[PDB]
Amino acid sequence: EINEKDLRKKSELQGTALGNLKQIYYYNEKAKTENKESHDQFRQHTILFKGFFTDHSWYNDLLVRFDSKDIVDKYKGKKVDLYGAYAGYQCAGGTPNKTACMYGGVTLHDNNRLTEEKKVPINLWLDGKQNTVPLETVKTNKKNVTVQELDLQARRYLQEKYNLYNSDVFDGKVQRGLIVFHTSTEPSVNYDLFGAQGQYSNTLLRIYRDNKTINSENMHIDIYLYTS
């Protein structure tokens, strides 16, 4: 859905934007658990996992937020697996004290586990030159996987290897970047790595609120990074 000349420059990011992006993709807290269920709803298009956290320094409950009633209805009252980044700062006003919020991150549990862990191949280009990416960098045990699960893993590696969301003074050389989740069937999801209004940490991950899921079978990821 995006061409390279239309990629947003890192220099456009205002204020706390880079710091927020680095936190959400490299210093995050993730819910990663299997075979859970809830049909408790707070309001809106949400599933509330009461007492999800037993040893968190602030949270007791996890609130999952979705875009629509059709999406929440797919998962409400079903055995699901979770894989997403949560935080209190992701909640809308009036969410209960000690509740943390995640956007999407849910998949049906049943019949979704692969027998062999899927290593998702990555094609990465930096200023047009291919760079080798370890095959274990992005992996999943799910047949139907959230784009969130794959994007969190890919961007954590981009921060570690290329200092993606570091300032220019802290060796963050990449100025533009695109990630594509290239499926066998289905138009591919693509995200501009510098496309968000990063200064609003509460909505940074609202892109995942659609709970988009894709088939991992035979898929791969393409990453295009530019230093200008």
Residue set of the binding site for Zn(2+): 182, 220, 222
Window contacting Zn ion (CB under 5 A); options: 47-55, 77-85, 176-184, 189-197:
176-184
Interface with Zn ion, residue 222, by CB under 5 A: yes
Ramachandran class of 185: left when φ > 0, alpha when ψ lies in -120 to 50, beta otherwise: beta
List the one residue from 182, 208, 219, 223 that touches Zn ion (CB under 5 A). Answer: 182
Closest CB to Zn ion belongs to which residue?
A: 182
Instruction: Report which DSSP code applies to 129.
Output: E
Q: Give the separation between CA 184 and CA 217, rounded to whole angstroms.
A: 8
Window contacting Zn ion (CB under 5 A); options: 14-22, 66-74, 134-142, 215-223:
215-223
At its nearest, how many Å lie between Zn ion and the CB of residue 188? 7
Nearer to Zn ion, 210 or 222 (CB): 222
At its nearest, how many Å lie between Zn ion and the CB of residue 123? 6
Residue 134 is encoded by which pair of tokens?
């370890």
Nearer to Zn ion, 53 or 157 (CB): 157
Interface with Zn ion, residue 138, by CB under 5 A: no
Closest by Cα among 27, 10, 99 to 59: 99
Nearer to Zn ion, 53 or 181 (CB): 181
Interface with Zn ion, residue 190, by CB under 5 A: no
Q: Can you name the residues that pair with 88 across neighbouring β-strands?
A: none
Nearer to Zn ion, 142 or 182 (CB): 182
At its nearest, how many Å lie between Zn ion and the CB of residue 181? 9
Window contacting Zn ion (CB under 5 A); options: 28-36, 139-147, 181-189, 208-216:
181-189
Closest by Cα among 65, 71, 29, 31 to 48: 65
Question: Which amino acid is present at 33?
Answer: T
CB burial of residue 30 (10 Å; 0-12, 13-18, 19+): middle
Ramachandran class of 114: left when φ > 0, alpha when ψ lies in -120 to 50, beta otherwise: beta
Q: Give the separation between CA 102 and CA 33, rounded to whole angstroms.
A: 13
Chain positions contacting Zn ion, by CB under 5 A: 182, 222
